[PDB]
Amino acid sequence: QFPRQCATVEALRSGMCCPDLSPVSGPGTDRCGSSSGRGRCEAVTADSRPHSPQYPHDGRDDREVWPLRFFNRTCHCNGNFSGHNCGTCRPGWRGAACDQRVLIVRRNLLDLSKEEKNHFVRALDMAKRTTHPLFVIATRRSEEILGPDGNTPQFENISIYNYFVWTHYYSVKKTFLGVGQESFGEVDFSHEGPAFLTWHRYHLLRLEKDMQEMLQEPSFSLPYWNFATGKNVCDICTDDLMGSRSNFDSTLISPNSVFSQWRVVCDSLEDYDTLGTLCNSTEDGPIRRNPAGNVARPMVQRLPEPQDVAQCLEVGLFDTPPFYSNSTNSFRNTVEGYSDPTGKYDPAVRSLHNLAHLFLNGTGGQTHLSPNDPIFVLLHTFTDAVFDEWLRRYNADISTFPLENAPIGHNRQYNMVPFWPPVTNTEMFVTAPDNLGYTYEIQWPSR
Ligand SMILES: *[C@@H]1O[C@H](CO[C@@H]2O[C@@H](C)[C@@H](O)[C@@H](O)[C@@H]2O)[C@@H](O[C@@H]2O[C@H](CO)[C@@H](O[C@@H]3O[C@H](CO[C@H]4O[C@H](CO)[C@@H](O)[C@H](O)[C@@H]4O)[C@@H](O)[C@H](O[C@H]4O[C@H](CO)[C@@H](O)[C@H](O)[C@@H]4O)[C@@H]3O)[C@H](O)[C@H]2NC(C)=O)[C@H](O)[C@H]1NC(C)=O
Ligand SMILES: *[C@@H]1O[C@H](CO[C@@H]2O[C@@H](C)[C@@H](O)[C@@H](O)[C@@H]2O)[C@@H](O[C@@H]2O[C@H](CO)[C@@H](O[C@@H]3O[C@H](CO[C@H]4O[C@H](CO)[C@@H](O)[C@H](O)[C@@H]4O)[C@@H](O)[C@H](O[C@H]4O[C@H](CO)[C@@H](O)[C@H](O)[C@@H]4O)[C@@H]3O)[C@H](O)[C@H]2NC(C)=O)[C@H](O)[C@H]1NC(C)=O
Ligand SMILES: *[C@@H]1O[C@H](CO)[C@@H](O[C@@H]2O[C@H](CO)[C@@H](O[C@@H]3O[C@H](CO[C@H]4O[C@H](CO)[C@@H](O)[C@H](O)[C@@H]4O)[C@@H](O)[C@H](O[C@H]4O[C@H](CO)[C@@H](O)[C@H](O)[C@@H]4O)[C@@H]3O)[C@H](O)[C@H]2NC(C)=O)[C@H](O)[C@H]1NC(C)=O
Ligand SMILES: *[C@@H]1O[C@H](CO[C@@H]2O[C@@H](C)[C@@H](O)[C@@H](O)[C@@H]2O)[C@@H](O[C@@H]2O[C@H](CO)[C@@H](O[C@@H]3O[C@H](CO)[C@@H](O)[C@H](O)[C@@H]3O)[C@H](O)[C@H]2NC(C)=O)[C@H](O)[C@H]1NC(C)=O
Ligand SMILES: *[C@@H]1O[C@H](CO)[C@@H](O[C@@H]2O[C@H](CO)[C@@H](O[C@@H]3O[C@H](CO)[C@@H](O)[C@H](O)[C@@H]3O)[C@H](O)[C@H]2NC(C)=O)[C@H](O)[C@H]1NC(C)=O
Ligand SMILES: *[C@@H]1O[C@H](CO)[C@@H](O[C@@H]2O[C@H](CO)[C@@H](O)[C@H](O)[C@H]2NC(C)=O)[C@H](O)[C@H]1NC(C)=O
Ligand SMILES: *[C@@H]1O[C@H](CO)[C@@H](O)[C@H](O)[C@H]1NC(C)=O
Ligand SMILES: [Zn+2]
Numbered sequence: 001q002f003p004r005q006c007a008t009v010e011a012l013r014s015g016m017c018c019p020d021l022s023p024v025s026g027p028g029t030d031r032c033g034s035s036s037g038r039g040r041c042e043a044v045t046a047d048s049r050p051h052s053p054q055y056p057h058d059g060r061d062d063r064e065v066w067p068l069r070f071f072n073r074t075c076h077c078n079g080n081f082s083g084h085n086c087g088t089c090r091p092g093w094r095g096a097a098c099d100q101r102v103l104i105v106r107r108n109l110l111d112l113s114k115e116e117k118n119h120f121v122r123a124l125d126m127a128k129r130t131t132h133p134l135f136v137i138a139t140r141r142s143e144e145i146l147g148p149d150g151n152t153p154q155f156e157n158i159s160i161y162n163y164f165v166w167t168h169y170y171s172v173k174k175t176f177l178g179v180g181q182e183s184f185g186e187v188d189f190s191h192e193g194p195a196f197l198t199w200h201r202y203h204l205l206r207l208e209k210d211m212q213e214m215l216q217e218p219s220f221s222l223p224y225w226n227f228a229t230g231k232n233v234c235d236i237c238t239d240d241l242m243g244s245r246s247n248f249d250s251t252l253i254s255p256n257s258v259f260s261q262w263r264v265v266c267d268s269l270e271d272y273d274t275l276g277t278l279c280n281s282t283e284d285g286p287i288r289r290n291p292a293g294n295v296a297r298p299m300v301q302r303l304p305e306p307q308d309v310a311q312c313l314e315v316g317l318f319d320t321p322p323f324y325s326n327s328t329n330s331f332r333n334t335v336e337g338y339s340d341p342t343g344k345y346d347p348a349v350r351s352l353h354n355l356a357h358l359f360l361n362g363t364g365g366q367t368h369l370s371p372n373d374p375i376f377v378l379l380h381t382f383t384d385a386v387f388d389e390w391l392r393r394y395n396a397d398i399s400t401f402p403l404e405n406a407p408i409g410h411n412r413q414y415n416m417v418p419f420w421p422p423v424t425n426t427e428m429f430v431t432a433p434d435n436l437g438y439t440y441e442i443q444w445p446s447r
């Protein structure tokens with residue numbers, strides 16, 4: 001989850017992730033671009049406020065008080081500079097001086113042209129294969145992070161798109177308690193709490209940025225999939241888009257789509273939760289996808305209706321106590337999908353975003369795996385569009401986003417786990433077009 005420049009014995013020992021930008025006088029002579037005023041290495045700011053009693057294991061999980069278990073000094077950039085070493089720009093800015101505004105448009109995937117749809121499919125496939133230039137992934141927890149001999153960092157290179165899968169897996173994985181003990185599962189740093197919407201917003205922002213740089217196309221944008229059509233087929237599952245059903249196995253993607261060639265990461269939970277290891281970059285197994293196929297669970301055999309979206313946008317409070325998956329009259333919990341679209345909680349209901357996952361009846365409907373199916377990207381740009389329309393309609397009212405006593409990882413000033421550089425829920429809780437450099441070309445139904 002860290003810059004490869006920081007995945008070193010020296011850096012892990014010093015507790016400092018403050019890499020050079022333009023060091024002319026040797027290594028360490030331009031940390032954070034301080035030579036040119038772009039930033040300085042400074043102490044980390046991390047949330048110290050209480051969380052709900054759902055998690056009883058403080059001191060046991062590296063994700064706690066992110067990123068203090070790994071680094072307590074980081075680059076603090078000035079002005080509109082940003083990034084791990086202050087070498088890029090805050091959202092909405094670009095250029096070598098971070099003084100050119102940028103506004104990218106995220107469109108309905110079905111409204112793209114033939115060339116644009118093809119360009120997008122090729123861009124995903126390229127991200128699946130291209131090594132992430134900056135980030136490497138830990139394969140062991142902190143105590144074993146330097147390997148058996150104490151001098152070999154347990155990090156791996158990983159592709160741009162598998163990194164997108166990995167951070168998701170790491171935010172939802174169980175707390176490892178010890179060999180021979182059951183791993184603890186009532187923890188999730190990106191779901192079942194107020195941070196669900198802002199965590200997934202940054203997730204997309206980061207992938208869109210990495211894909212722009214991979215392509216060297218600064219205006220590249222992620223499209224969305226309007227899944228609220230009431231249909232019981234997947235209208236983007238075609239061989240020019242995200243792949244039709246295989247005629248040889250109804251749970252695999254058609255061999256006429258490159259997405260039948262993808263192999264998935266992080267599907268060895270039994271190993272991680274018993275051995276105490278983490279998902280690594282070795283791929284194993286194809287995408288499973290069987291839209292409408294869950295005959296044993298008929299409620300998840302049809303997608304949400306248009307009116308379900310219109311109703312969830314009538315829910316006025318962003319979130320409500322206990323800020324969890326049983327919150328009632330909470331917009332966050334409604335659109336996440338643990339309440340029906342009017343806001344009323346019911347333990348048996350799956351709606352909206354949750355329902356769209358389960359409709360896929362495959363890789364895309366399992367929490368630790370779901371980004372492996374690239375429909376995830378489009379399902380979440382649409383979810384992010386609902387969120388952005390809510391922020392417009394209710395003046396980005398953050399007042400019900402709790403400052404304390406949220407489930408762990410979901411307090412307002414928590415650094416969302418495991419994003420780098422550190423970034424809070426508050427930074428994503430702004431209307432996108434004015435503040436984050438992107439906007440949705442979309443229309444909202446009535447009633
Ligand atoms: C920011 O991180 C700094 C680097 O630490 C690493 O990275 C962070 C992110 C974590 O992952 C951490 O686990 C990593 O170690 C960190 O600097 C380190 O801080 C410790 C504690 O202050 C320094 O310890 C000092 O060292 C010597 C001896 O080293 C060990 O000895 C004693 C045994 O007696 C241990 O208890 C210590 O923890 C040391 O590990 C001692 O001179 C001294 O310990 C004595 O005094 C203190 C205070 O009275 C007592 O707690 C002890 O019991 C001892 O009586 C110091 O504690 C460690 O050397 C230092 N490393 C470096 C490279 O500087 C820093 O604390 C972090 N800052 C913040 C604000 O979080
Ligand atoms: C929203 O969900 C909340 C979290 O729910 C979790 O996940 C779901 C799926 C359920 O399974 C749920 O039970 C899980 O916890 C939920 O909060 C939970 O609410 C329940 C019911 O009020 C609480 O259980 C009761 O808690 C007390 C307190 O326990 C603590 O303190 C005592 C004293 O220090 C210690 O002994 C405990 O170990 C804990 O430290 C218990 O006293 C009590 O036991 C009594 O009842 C049981 C019958 O079940 C008898 O066996 C006992 O003898 C006692 O008579 C209960 O266990 C639970 O703590 C709480 N969990 C958390 C994490 O907050 C919340 O209610 C939901 N909200 C709504 C509106 O539905
Ligand atoms: C990247 O991550 C992947 C995914 O975790 C790792 O690959 C897996 O590694 C695990 C752990 O080593 C492997 O799981 C083990 O497989 C063994 C071989 O299985 C034979 O015997 C079992 C009986 O249990 C049969 O079901 C099976 O068909 C074979 O005949 C088993 O021996 C293991 O169980 C035994 O060992 C463990 C200790 O590991 C004991 O606790 C158990 O009680 C038991 O005795 C275990 O199931 C797994 O097969 C690997 N998967 C793949 C796809 O390769 C990579 O290693 C990892 N890479 C890096 C570099 O970290
Ligand atoms: C990630 O992979 C790189 C190599 O891959 C290259 O860099 C990536 C960041 C991407 O751009 C890839 O597409 C690209 O191919 C590994 O870097 C390599 O590390 C090794 C081991 O430390 C280096 O070997 C050394 O080489 C010299 C001889 O050349 C000797 O002095 C040393 O004894 C030692 O053997 C190697 O030079 C280095 N670079 C390259 C280009 O191969 C990197 O380790 C890896 N990171 C992780 C965390 O696995
Ligand atoms: C995709 O949909 C299929 C088909 O609906 C799902 O398979 C079904 O999974 C359920 C839950 O595990 C199975 O129910 C179980 O059945 C037996 C008794 O027969 C018992 O062990 C349990 O008590 C439980 O009720 C169900 O049998 C099974 N159906 C089939 C045809 O295998 C599948 O889980 C879905 N996959 C994903 C990833 O969503
Ligand atoms: C960095 O970007 C911010 C906006 O993200 C700039 O601030 C705006 O600048 C215009 C033009 O001067 C003002 O009219 C706005 O009122 C400003 N908004 C805010 C929120 O300050 C800022 O000037 C840019 N440059 C820096 C910080 O050097
Ligand atoms: C929905 O799919 C079912 C099987 O899942 C199929 O029988 C049916 O024709 C589809 N749609 C409608 C509108 O009945
Ligand atoms: Zn998710």
Ligand SMILES: [Zn+2]
Pocket residue numbers: 353357380
């Ligand atoms: Zn999701």
